[PDB]
Structures are given as C-alpha cells and as structure tokens.
Design a protein around this ligand. Structure first.
Ligand SMILES: CC(C)=CCC/C(C)=C/COP(=O)(O)OP(=O)(O)O
Ligand SMILES: CC(C)=CCC/C(C)=C/COP(=O)(O)OP(=O)(O)O
Ligand SMILES: O=P(O)(O)C(O)(Cn1ccnc1)P(=O)(O)O
Ligand SMILES: O=P(O)(O)C(O)(Cn1ccnc1)P(=O)(O)O
Ligand SMILES: [Mg+2]
Ligand SMILES: [Mg+2]
Ligand SMILES: [Mg+2]
Ligand SMILES: [Mg+2]
Ligand SMILES: [Mg+2]
Ligand SMILES: [Mg+2]
Lengths: 346, 346
C-alpha cells in the first residue's frame, strides 16, 4: 500500500509485456506497419501519467485478498488488471484532448497534435480502449471473476461516455448556458465523467479479483468512492485555472471552452451583479484577454482560498464517512486513496 | 432467408426497443438531458442503412438452428444480436466520416457536420459502440453463448481498428505512397477494416446463438466470408468513384484523401508511364479539378468494364468455393449473402 516507489517500479515493469501482448511482439503478423505503429501509440499515450488508478487496483487487491493468496503470480494479475484501467484512462484522454482542443498532456503535445495523427487519434482512442478486453481474455478468462470484470468495464465505459456528453453540453450557439451552471448539474457531470472510472472501477476490480461479490460490500465501497470522485474532479478544475503547467503537464482550457467547472459554479454563487455581467460577457470566449479577465475575477472572489478551505472540510467529511464503513472492508484502503490525492498540485 | 420485405419489417420492429433499453425510457435517470440526446444519436446514426449485417445475423441463425427451436422469442434474440452488429456499424461510420472528411451518409449530413456535434461525434462514436455490450448483458447473460459472443465483438472491434489504421497510412507529407499501393496491401486493409465485422461477425454470431462451437465449422465459414468481404469492399471502392450519390446516399472522397482503393491499385497496374505521371501529380489532392482528372483517367483505362468483369469472375469463383464447404454448414446461407450484394449500386 501507500503508493511507494517500490509499488510504482513493480507496476511499471509489467507495461512492456502489455505492449508486447497488443502488438504481437515475437509473433508473425500480416500487418506489421500497424502493430509497429500501435506500439508507439501505447508508448506515447498510456504509461507517463501518475498511474493512480492502476496502482489503486493493485493496492485494493493487496488489502482485500487473504495474505496467503498474495503470490507473485496473483500480484502480477492485479497489476495487469491495473494496466487495463490505465488503457481506459489513455483512451479517454486522447478523445478528451480532441474535444477540449487541448495543447499539452503529461508534458508533451496532445496525441492529435502530433505529425500524421490528427483525426486518426479518434481510431487510436477506439483501438486503445478495445485492447484492454484482449488483455482481460489472455490472463483472466479461466477465473470466476472474468464476466463480472468484463461487465464492470462495459458499464463504466458507457457511464463515462454519458458524463463526457453532459460535460460537452455546457455551450450552445457559442455561448455558455450560465443559468444551468448549478452544483446539481456539476455533481451529475463529475459522477459520470470521472467518479465511476477513477475510483469505483479500481476498487471493484480489486474486490472481484479477491472473489468478493457481496452486493452490500460493493454498495458501501461505491458510496465512499463516488464522494472521493467528486472531490478529485473539483481538484482537477482548480488545477485547470491555477495549476503550474510544468507540474500538472497540461495547459487549462475550461474558461475558453465555457465548461461547467467547480470554479465557474462557485464564481456564479459568490458574484455580485457586476461580477455576473463579467462572466456573461467573457466566459467561454476564444480571446486570451477574455480568459485573463475571468482568472482576475476568480482571484478577486478568493476562489483559491475558497477551494483550499473546501478541500480541507471535504477531506474531514469523507474521513467521517469512511469511519462508518462496516463489513470486512478495510478503512485503510479508502484512507490511503484520500491521502494520495489530498492537496495534490498535479 | 432471402432478405425479404417481411424479414426487414420484423427486424425494424425491434429497433425502438433497442433505443428504449439504451436511453432508460420509462425509468428514472438523474441525467435526462444525455439520455434524451442519446435517443437522437441512435435514431440518426443506427437504423437508416441497408441493415445487411443485422439481417445476415438473423438469416444465419434461422438457417443454422434446428427448426423446432425457431420460436418467436429465439428469432427476436437473433434480431437483437443483429442490432448489436448495426450498433458497431453505426459507431464505425460516425468515426470513419470524421477521418475521411465526408459530406453525406445515408442521404443526410455526416453526424459530425450537424449543429453542436463536431468533435462530440468522437464521444458519440465511443458511446454507440459501448452500448451494444449493455444489450448483450440484458438478453444473453444467462446463455452458454454469452462469453463467446462478447469475446467475438471485442476481437472484431480490435481487428477493425487495425484495418482503419492501415487504411489511414495511405498518405505521409500530404502525398499518397503510390509505390506501396499493391494488391497485397489492398487485401490486408480490407481483411481488417471490412471483412471481419461485415461477414465473419454476423455468421459466427448466428452459429453461437445456435450453440455451434465446432472450430472446423467456424474456420470453413471464415474462409468463405473473408473472400466475400474483399469482394464487398471492392464494390464499395467502385461506388466511391462511379456511384450515384442519390442511390448510395454518400459522396465519394477516396481520390481526394489519396486512399489505397481497388481503383487506385488497378489504375497503377494498367497505367502507361504518362498515366502513372497523372496519378503521381493529381491523386490525393484537395482541388476538384485534380479529382476530375483522376476520374477521367479511370474512364480512359476502362475501370468500369474491368470492375464489371472482375465482379462476375469473383462471383463465379466464390460460388465454386461455397460448393466445397462441408460439415452441416448450409451452402444456401453463403449463396443468399452473395446474391444480396452481387451487382449492387448501393
Ligand atoms: C512531465 C509532466 C509534468 C507530467 C505530468 C504527469 C501527471 C501529473 C499526470 C497526471 O496523471 P494522468 O495523466 O493519468 O491524469 P489524472 O490527473 O486524470 O489522473
Ligand atoms: C436515402 C439514401 C440514398 C440512403 C442510402 C442507404 C444505404 C444504401 C446505405 C448502405 O448501408 P450502410 O450505411 O450500412 O453501409 P454499408 O454499405 O457499409 O453496408
Ligand atoms: O477536465 P476534464 O474532464 O476534461 C479532464 O479531467 C479529463 N477527464 C475527462 C473525463 N474525466 C476527466 P482533464 O483536465 O485531464 O482534461
Ligand atoms: O471506404 P471506407 O472504408 O471509408 C467505407 O466503406 C466505410 N468503412 C470503414 C471501414 N470499413 C468500411 P465508406 O465508403 O462507407 O465510407
Ligand atoms: Mg480535458
Ligand atoms: Mg474534458
Ligand atoms: Mg480538467
Ligand atoms: Mg469512408
Ligand atoms: Mg474510411
Ligand atoms: Mg468507401
């Protein structure tokens, strides 16, 4: 547990085998041009993030499984399951960068902006997603958890798509629909676009690999992880406006794209009539000066301190909710996840 | 069998239930804005094609299953399985139209060109694909064929992505790689981008729903269906240059996008040095006059008559190969598929 350097190195050591499995490395193919290119798609887009979701899968398994069952082989299976989550993440971010007209991801150009990619990034998005099911078939097809694991990936993929769609409906006729930027809409967006795939998916996979199918245990885990998910996406929204791109690895676009971000929702709650006028005039505009005006309003409204205090109070509340978790569910699993993301700058 | 009007009407009657299943029609949702929009995504993009692949799934089942097992309920399951193939087709075409910068699909604007879609079509592509697995879980999760069916969809999706990628690598530095436009490259492209999902997938699904898992029966079916698939994509390539858009429902882009089409490959085989120079100068150019010059060369080289004769000879050869099919595999299934596509103008 505790997302150590050793934990990261054991997880990273699996990645080259995932690439070999999906590119027929060492095996005859009639289409080597595609398998060689797909190696570069995977190497660019999959392994250079924080790997929070992959590592969370392994830590969940290690803390849920009986100690006597934690063989090197079973721990490797959990790591492979973690990489399947990272393949879903990689696919989502390729598509998300196209939709958000983003510049940088993980400190390199967004994949769609690279030479001879463009709209081919759409196919690469689909290709990376489809590839996780090939890995699942190879290593898990013989196990009782196989169908539960596949059905969970299918369901989380569908839910994430619904979330990406609601996120995108922030604008119509080139202006943001500020009247609809409520905390209710915000909670709905982040539940579907982030919480299911980021927190619910890793822990539920850990439970399934340990042959834990109890509906009440899954429901209790889900309740806490959907709260953690909302908290995580609020942190992401703060990073978009106030993050250092040299640390976050990405340049923010939420203001220009007119997104229903936490900062936008809270700005509208805290705004006097004049400040509301500034949002209505300058939010979701292409002009750099319009973005700077909105950032200046965010600073004037004290959004940095408001976020800082919200993050501390939300951390305390989630810790209270974790204390209420029963069954055999280890509290320390949820505490470790929270400790890993709390007050993050990336 | 025989793709009758009655067959089409029975298949079409299932579609509204597929839409209701994927949009929580009659059920409470916290995100009605997305479920209502997704109804319009499905209604626009899924049901207005020829439905050859969906209908082929039903006809395969009806000709492989024991007559006493062809209850209305089992025939409905085959139709639902057919609609899962049509969801995969719908997803592929949304993405393919973005990548091919196409104007029209099924006699209406390409989905990405509609108001307030754009790059959101990428998400809609992913959403429509993920949705077929929800339908599979609802109606088939209790059946022996469930895992075989899921694994076949996963494998065919991955293969189709590899094919879309090879298709896209026709150009580098804005010029087509005419030296690589060989019949060998062509056969590889169409095997992956068309044959698996168009012909192999429907018949293999029909076999699985009839609990036919014999590896040799699947291999024999695959051999004929990969031949039919290549034949079908050659017909598609002819339609791109010489089709009537009022009949095909789509405007061709292969010449402008510099595609390794059958017409391009055969043009290069049949071209004298001067005619080769015309391809090298005018193939894969944005200027309308460049496209017209290539179409004029195609007419001069007699590509219409060359295609017409190829189609007749290929039909005869495939019919010979079908005669060689053994086991209990019904020859009439493969004959019906060929009769449905032979000399098509759409
Ligand atoms: C060279 C640099 C500065 C790289 C930045 C790496 C980084 C902090 C990525 C976040 O993980 P992710 O990409 O998986 O995203 P998420 O925040 O959604 O977990
Ligand atoms: C109003 C008009 C003219 C509509 C055209 C309909 C049509 C012939 C679609 C082909 O089916 P499809 O879209 O499923 O494609 P494919 O050729 O790949 O089967
Ligand atoms: O803000 P987004 O939702 O676009 C983002 O968090 C990615 N994402 C997409 C869905 N869930 C998360 P990112 O800031 O990484 O570009
Ligand atoms: O020619 P394409 O491969 O792009 C096509 O056939 C679609 N497609 C994509 C993959 N297989 C078939 P369409 O002419 O319908 O645009
Ligand atoms: Mg983004
Ligand atoms: Mg986004
Ligand atoms: Mg963000
Ligand atoms: Mg096309
Ligand atoms: Mg295409
Ligand atoms: Mg075509």
């Amino acid at each position: 547990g505790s997302f150590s350097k050793e934990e990261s190195r054991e997880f990273m050591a699996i990645f080259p085998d995932i690439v070999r499995d999906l590119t027929d490395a060492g095996r005859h193919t009639d289409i080597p041009e595609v398998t060689k290119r797909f190696a570069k798609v995977l190497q660019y887009n999959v392994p250079t993030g924080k790997k929070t979701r992959g590592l969370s899968t392994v830590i969940a398994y290690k803390m849920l499984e009986k100690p006597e069952n934690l063989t090197p082989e079973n721990v490797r299976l959990a790591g492979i399951l973690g990489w399947c989550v990272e393949l879903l993440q990689a696919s989502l971010l390729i598509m998300d960068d196209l939709m958000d007209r983003s510049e940088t991801r993980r400190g390199q150009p967004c994949w769609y902006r690279q030479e001879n990619v463009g709209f081919l990034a759409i196919n690469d998005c689909l290709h990376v997603e489809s590839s996780l099911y090939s890995v699942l078939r190879k290593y898990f097809s013989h196990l009782p958890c196989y169908v539960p694991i596949i059905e969970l990936f299918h369901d989380v993929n569908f839910k994430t798509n619904m979330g990406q769609s609601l996120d995108a409906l922030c604008m119509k006729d080139g202006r943001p629909i500020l009247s609809q930027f409520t905390m209710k809409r915000y909670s709905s967006i982040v539940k579907y676009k982030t919480s299911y795939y980021t927190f619910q998916l890793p822990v539920s996979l850990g439970m399934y690999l340990a042959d834990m199918y109890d509906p009440e245990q899954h429901r209790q885990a889900k309740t806490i992880l959907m709260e953690i998910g909302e908290f995580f996406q609020i942190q992401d929204d703060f990073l978009d406006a106030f993050g250092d791109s040299q640390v976050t690895g990405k340049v923010g676009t939420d203001i220009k794209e007119g997104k229903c971000s936490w900062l936008a929702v809270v700005a509208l709650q805290r705004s006097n009539p004049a400040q509301r006028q500034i949002m209505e005039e300058h939010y979701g505009r292409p002009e750099p000066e319009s973005t700077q005006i909105i950032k200046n309003l965010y600073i004037e409204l004290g959004l940095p301190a408001t976020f800082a205090v919200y993050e501390e109070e939300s951390f305390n509340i989630i810790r209270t909710h974790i204390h209420q978790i029963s069954k055999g569910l280890p509290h320390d699993l949820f505490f470790k996840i929270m400790k890993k993301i709390y007050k993050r700058d990336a």
